[PDB]
Every structure is written in structure tokens, then in C-alpha cells.
Amino acid sequence: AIEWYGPDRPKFLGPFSEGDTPAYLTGEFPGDYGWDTAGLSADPETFKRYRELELIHARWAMLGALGCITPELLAKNGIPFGEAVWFKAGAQIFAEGGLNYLGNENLIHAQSIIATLAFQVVVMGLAEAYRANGGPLGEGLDPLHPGGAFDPLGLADDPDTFAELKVKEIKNGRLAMFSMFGFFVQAIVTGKGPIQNLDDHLANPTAVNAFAYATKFTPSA
């Protein structure tokens, strides 16, 4: 069981996964568990673009799953900055003094969403287009894992643990995408923060769960 590659590997149905795992999923990629029940990635070009899209979704979801928990995690310590939930965090731009980073007034404290939006558009278009094509740190390399200045700490060498950390990255990333979809729907249905949902679940699990909010979206008409 100590492998994430080869023909025999950990799979998404466990011991129920011999009749699954078709011929074009061979375990040659980080995170192959034989889950292609829909059959979306038969073509290896389609499979390559889906793997790239999945891994950049993994990176942005690992960024997001921590950036949504840290405002409520510093509201746990008692640092007050406007609002601690993530899905009502943008409106602090439109506050009486603007969105503050850590609440201390000598910090970022920007007020106009349109100017920082334009700055985000230009530098993120430049950075992501350098990610797709190439720029001043590496022109033609892997579209998945460039390295170079992306590994200043030297974890890209010794390629077996590079593959092992690739599987670790895609596993934590898939857990982060699952967590971020759960964050989205806990924001939609409950309307409170996810750490607040954790406090309400730890305070009373048996009556306050998702089935408590099961009758919310019932169409009355």
C-alpha cells in the first residue's frame, strides 16, 4: 500500500474498485484513484487540461480554505476588524473607514474597490499569462510544476519524494476543494460563518446539523 502509482494503488472505492479504473487511468499521475465514473477524460489532451485545471484549483483552494478560516481564527483571540466571516468580508471596503487588514489603523486601510480591482486585473493577468506561457523566471518548462525560483528551499530534487509530495499536494488540494464547496454551501444555506457553524455543532450536534436547515429552501408559493 506504500505507493501512489503503478497498476495497484489506493483507489476511491477501496476493495470495491476492481471493476472500476478503466484503461486510460493507469496510475501514472499524482492522485490517481480510478475515479472516472463519468468518463470525462478519455482523451489524454483533455485529461492533461483537466489535470492542470484540477491542480490550479487545488492551489487556489488550499489558499482559500486557510484564508477563510484565519479571520475567524483571529476573531477567536479577540482582534476586532469589521467582520470575521469571509462571505460578508468584501463589504468592509464600503465601511465608514474602509477595510482594515488587522484592525490597526496604520495598516493597509484601502477604500476604493475599483482602483485595487484595476491593479489586481493588470498584475494578475500578467502573472497568470506568465504562468501559462513564460516570463522572466523560466520560459519553457512544465505547465504544472515549474520550480526554479518556485523551489528556493530545494524540495524539487530526489524525484521519488517529489512524486510523493505531488500526491500529498493533490490530496490536500482535493480536501481543500471539498472544504471550499462545503464553505460555499454552509454560507448559502446557514448564512453564518463556518467556524461559527463548528461552534454551533460542538455546542449542540444532535439538533443543530444540516438537517436542521433541511426545510429552509422549501418552495412555498
Partner 1 sequence: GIEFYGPNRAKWLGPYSENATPAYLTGEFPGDYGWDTAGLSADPETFKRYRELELIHARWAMLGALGCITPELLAKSGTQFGEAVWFKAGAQIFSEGGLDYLGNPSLVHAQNIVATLAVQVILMGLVEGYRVNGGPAGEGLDPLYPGESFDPLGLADDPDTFAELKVKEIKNGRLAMFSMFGFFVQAIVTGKGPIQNLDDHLSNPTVNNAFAFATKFTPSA
Q: Which does 88 bind (CB under 5 to 8 A by kind): ligand CLA, ligand LUT, partner 1, none?
A: partner 1
Choosing among ligand CHL, ligand LUT, partner 1, none, which partner's interface includes residue 191 (Cβ < 5 to 8 Å by kind)?
partner 1
220 marked among binding-site residues: no
* CA–CA separation, 129 and 148 (whole Å): 18
Based on the shown chain and the rule CB under 6 A, indicate whether residue 31 belongs to the binding site for ligand CLA: yes
Binding of ligand CLA by 169 (CB under 6 A): no
Neighbours of 116 (CB within 10 A): 14
In angstroms, what is the minimal distance from the CB of 51 to partner 1? 9
Torsion angle in degrees (nearest 10) through CA of 179, 184, 190, 196:
50
Do 41 and 32 contact (CB within 8 A), yes or no? no
Asked if 189 contacts 216 with a C-beta cutoff of 8 angstroms, the reply is: yes
**Positions 20 through 49 that interact with partner 1 (CB under 8 A):** 20, 22-24, 36-40, 42-43, 45-49
Q: Measuring CA to CA, which residue among 60, 17, 45 is closest to residue 174? A: 60
CA atoms of 214 and 191, how far apart (whole Å): 13
Handedness of CA 147, 56, 137, 117 (dihedral sign): negative
Residues 6+ apart with CB under 8 A from 132: 143
Q: How near is the Cβ of 197 to ligand LUT at its closest, in Å?
A: 4
Positions touching partner 1 (CB under 8 A) are: 13-20, 22-24, 36-40, 42-43, 45-50, 52-53, 87-88, 90-91, 93-94, 113-114, 129-130, 132-135, 140, 143, 187-191, 206, 209, 211, 214-215, 218-221
Positions touching ligand CLA (CB under 6 A) are: 12, 25, 29, 31-36, 40-41, 47, 50-51, 53-54, 57, 174, 177-179, 181-182, 185-186, 189-190, 197-198, 200-201, 208-210, 213
